[PDB]
């Protein structure tokens, strides 16, 4: 009865990837945001 | 033990959903970011085509220039008076363009039809009909079209409202004209103004042209000396030019406005310019009572509220004065705590309305 735990656990880093990688994708333009603005 | 799926999916669901929420804004902003590279490009109308490339174009910002085509350019399509995008350095066509100018709702004032129909201000009914037939209909019956129509009497009696009520009935775009802006200073801008008022309407026709109370840009002037009056005369004439000139009202019609008629150029009143001199007398005791139960009674009122006796004391009032009668009693209403006006509120007002003037 613990499978989906470890199964939904192995999702989190791959889940986290999404936000963690977009935080890159954030700053990428967030800079360019600030850049061409400022 | 099983609380982890949430703590897994809790993070997950939001996280995986928080993906493009953030992510959308980037590219959009990025476009904005990017578009900052996209640079402005000058404008002008082709005065004419010298050669296939060679063009005579007065800069929409300034004087004429000899220029060539550029690219994606149709030396066919390029033609007199055609708005084109122009270049800042190359100084040639940066694009071929549609065209229109002016603050349509501001310098031009663009409102479609009118707010309330002719009926709501009814009691001017003589005009109401009389104008409609000489304004609205001549469109729909090819069997002169009318030149011009000039209100006079006190404004807004429904008077200014007439225009909207007029404007409402036809379907044309009502285009309001206040005067002096058409030549503030602004040491020029006359026909360009008015012709945009003409031409836009001429293209956007049906349009109603309503020129407010035109004694600053209308009227015969003074010594007919130069105060810049020479500006006015022009402007005065610019209409004359569109009127005594071949320019017709195709589907666009012109309402002239004055509170006093005798204040206008005699030549302006002329047919070929004006075919109607629109009086707005005060409503009769009937017309009042007519307008009375119109403007007034539609504000919530008792039957206690005194209908005719008010009208009896109601004399030499206009359509808004009638409203004043209501509005004045309304003081007493809010003074008597009335949503429904009561006769008490009323005839205090009525005399009080009949007080300041007749």
UniProtKB/Swiss-Prot annotation, chain A:
Localization per Swiss-Prot or TrEMBL: Cytoplasm; Nucleus
Known post-translational modifications? N-acetylated by NAT1.
Modification type N-acetylalanine: residues: 2
**Domain of life the protein comes from:** Eukaryota
| Family as reported in the entry's similarity comment | Belongs to the AAA ATPase family.
Please give the function described in this protein's UniProt entry.
The 26S proteasome is involved in the ATP-dependent degradation of ubiquitinated proteins. The regulatory (or ATPase) complex confers ATP dependency and substrate specificity to the 26S complex.
Name assigned to this protein? 26S proteasome regulatory subunit 6A
Q: Which organism is it from?
A: Saccharomyces cerevisiae (strain ATCC 204508 / S288c)
Task: List the gene name.
Answer: RPT5
From Swiss-Prot, chain B:
Report a single Gene Ontology molecular function: ubiquitin protein ligase binding
Enumerate the UniProt keywords alphabetically. Answer: Acetylation, ATP-binding, Nucleotide-binding, Proteasome
Q: What domain of life does the UniProt record list for this protein's source?
A: Eukaryota
Q: Name one GO biological process term.
A: proteasome regulatory particle assembly
Q: What does this protein do?
A: The 26S proteasome is involved in the ATP-dependent degradation of ubiquitinated proteins. The regulatory (or ATPase) complex confers ATP dependency and substrate specificity to the 26S complex.
Instruction: Please give the family membership noted in the entry.
Output: Belongs to the AAA ATPase family.
The protein's name in its UniProt record = 26S proteasome subunit RPT4
Instruction: State the organism named in the record.
Output: Saccharomyces cerevisiae (strain ATCC 204508 / S288c)
Q: Which gene encodes it?
A: RPT4
Q: Which residues of the full protein are shown?
A: 63 to 427 of 437
């Amino acid at each position: 009865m613990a499978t989906l735990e470890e199964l939904d656990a192995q999702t989190l880093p791959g889940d986290d990837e999404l936000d963690q990688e977009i935080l890159n994708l954030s700053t990428q333009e967030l800079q360019t945001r600030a850049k061409l603005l400022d | 033990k099983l609380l982890e799926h949430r703590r897994y999916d809790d993070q997950l669901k939001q996280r995986r959903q928080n993906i493009r929420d953030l992510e959308k804004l980037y590219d959009k902003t990025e476009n904005d970011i990017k578009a900052l590279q996209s640079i402005g490009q000058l404008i002008g109308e082709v005065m004419k085509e010298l050669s296939e490339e060679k063009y005579i174009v007065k800069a929409s910002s300034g004087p004429r220039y000899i220029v060539g085509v550029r690219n994606s350019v149709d030396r066919s399509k390029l033609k007199k008076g055609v708005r084109v995008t122009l270049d800042i350095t190359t100084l040639t066509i940066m694009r071929i363009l549609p065209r229109e100018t002016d603050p349509l709702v501001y310098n031009m004032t663009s409102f479609e039809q009118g707010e309330i129909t002719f009926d709501g201000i009814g009691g001017l009914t003589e005009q109401i009909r009389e104008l409609r037939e000489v304004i609205e209909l001549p469109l729909k019956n090819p069997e002169k079209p009318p030149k011009g129509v000039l209100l006079y009497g006190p404004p807004g009696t429904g008077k200014t409202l007439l225009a909207k009520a007029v404007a409402a009935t036809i379907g044309a775009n009502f285009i309001f004209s206040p005067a002096s802006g058409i030549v503030d200073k602004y040491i020029g801008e006359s026909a360009r103004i008015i012709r945009e008022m003409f031409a836009y309407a001429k293209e956007h026709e049906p349009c109603i042209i309503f020129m407010d109370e035109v004694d600053a840009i209308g009227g015969r002037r003074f010594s007919e000396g130069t105060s810049a009056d020479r500006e006015i005369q022009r402007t005065l004439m610019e209409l004359l030019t569109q009127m005594d000139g071949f320019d017709n009202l195709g589907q666009t019609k012109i309402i002239m406005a004055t509170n006093r008629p005798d204040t206008l150029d005699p030549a302006l009143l002329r047919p070929g310019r004006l075919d109607r001199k629109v009086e707005i007398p005060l409503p009769n005791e009937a017309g009042r009572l007519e307008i009375f139960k119109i403007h007034t009674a539609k504000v919530k009122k008792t039957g206690e509220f005194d209908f005719e006796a008010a009208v009896k004391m109601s004399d030499g009032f206009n359509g808004a004065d009638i409203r004043n009668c209501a509005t004045e009693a309304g003081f007493f209403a809010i003074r008597d705590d009335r949503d429904h006006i009561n006769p008490d509120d009323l005839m205090k007002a009525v005399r009080k309305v009949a007080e300041v003037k007749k």
